[PDB]
Structure formats: C-alpha cells, structure tokens
Write a protein that binds this DNA or RNA. Sequence first.
DNA 1: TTGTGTTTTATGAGGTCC
DNA 2: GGACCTCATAAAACACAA
Length: 61
Amino acid sequence: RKKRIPYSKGQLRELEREYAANKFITKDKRRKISAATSLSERQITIWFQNRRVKEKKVLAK
DNA sequence: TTGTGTTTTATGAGGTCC
DNA sequence: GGACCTCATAAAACACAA
Ligand SMILES: [Mg+2]
C-alpha cells in the first residue's frame, strides 16, 4: 500500500487550528496548509476526513 | 522495558451533487 | 462529466498498564 508517515507537531498545530476554524477544508485553505506544512492537498483532505471521524467518536453518549 | 489496546495515516468502495 | 465527503478497514506508532 503506502507505509504511513506521522505528521509533525508543527504540521498538526496548523491542521488543528484550521479544523477548529472550520470542520470542512476549503480549496483556498487546503493550498495554504499545503504550503505551510509540506503535506499534499490529498493528505490535508484525508486528515480532515479522519479528524471528523475522531470528533464523531467524541460524541460517545 | 517488556506487551498489545488505542490512536493516527491511508486506501478503495460506494454515495451525493446539475 | 470530476470533486467531494462518510464508511469500514489495515498497519505503523503511541501511550501506558504491567
Ligand atoms: Mg454522503
């Protein structure tokens, strides 16, 4: 497949800041995050998908 | 500092949207 | 005629009882 590479403190800080601002990434913010973090647009899109799955688990009960 | 449950990336199947 | 997300899933890495 492709062996996963965990994101740095600096990369996660940027992703969580945007996620806190909006649960859904805009095309414009995805490019900004891509430039800031060196993650691909694809990675940023997937991380948002995964973050909403995590937030959904937090609505346990 | 072992072990092995949870959390974090990453994928592909199957959906919505004129 | 493509871009987008939710879902179940797998595996690498983490967190921390033991
Ligand atoms: Mg849907």
